[PDB]
Design a protein around this ligand. Sequence first.
Ligand SMILES: *C/C=C(C)/C=C\C=C(C)\C=C\C1=C(C)CCCC1(C)C
Length: 309
Amino acid sequence: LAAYMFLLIMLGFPINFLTLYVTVQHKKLRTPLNYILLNLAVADLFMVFGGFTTTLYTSLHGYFVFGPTGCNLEGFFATLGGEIALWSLVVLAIERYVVVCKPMSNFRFGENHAIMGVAFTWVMALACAAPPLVGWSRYIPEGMQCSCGIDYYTPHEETNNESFVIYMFVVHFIIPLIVIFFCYGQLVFTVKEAAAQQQESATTQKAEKEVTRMVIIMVIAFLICWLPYAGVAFYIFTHQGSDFGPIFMTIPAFFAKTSAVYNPVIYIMMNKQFRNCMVTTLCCGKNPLGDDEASTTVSKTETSQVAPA
Ligand SMILES: *C/C=C(C)/C=C\C=C(C)\C=C\C1=C(C)CCCC1(C)C
């Protein structure tokens, strides 16, 4: 595995470099909709803790085995490293969305709760600590966490798979999905809304028009894995290999390593710097005539202005 980890946690880093500069680039004016590279700093930098250091050093060849921990990009930083993306998109997706999901909540603060859902976030990182760590200490369980082996995992992996496949789900792509939908009914105020994510979505304060590329990606961000894998990930993680689920994994662990590709999910920058703009040159893009080179802070007295752009 060490060099599918370069094919594709290198080239993953550092075009997660020219991605993961960029929410340490300034440390942004973080957070916003680039909390996503503060969430996916602790989740696509930690997906390098991960695909360099320990899951590529000690981490799984390299090492090992080890353990370590959850494997631990896989148990930890792909909870975080995909969980956090499920979240980072129950917000983005559909941060059409946040702001019209919700109630724009104060004129902000349909920030949410996404800032404050960043405190929901470790709410499901103390709550993907809670089962998770007492997932391992449900006990061996601590199978491919500690072992990286067994022997609940398998006699009887159904609780254990059969609860977390069905435990993150249980709710985590149950209501959210059903809640979470609905203002993914701000996805029917979005299906007619790319006339809104176009003009209150090429123009709802922050980074957005291309915001509408919103949902070119964000339901292929749904789909990209998490349609063939909501398929071959639910049914996979009935788990049931020995020797065919894994292996098979990779493929079952490929597209969430081609969803460690925060590249066409930084542009989606977009998102702070595709608005500011309005202007003379170029696109990504915000009306578009030109789109530049305007707004900047406050968010403008001129030339691509003030709810800019
Ligand atoms: C690269 C390896 C990965 C991403 C390993 C595990 C993936 C998950 C625990 C996926 C969680 C999710 C599910 C089941 C459904 C909604 C989307 C999701 C990514 C949060």
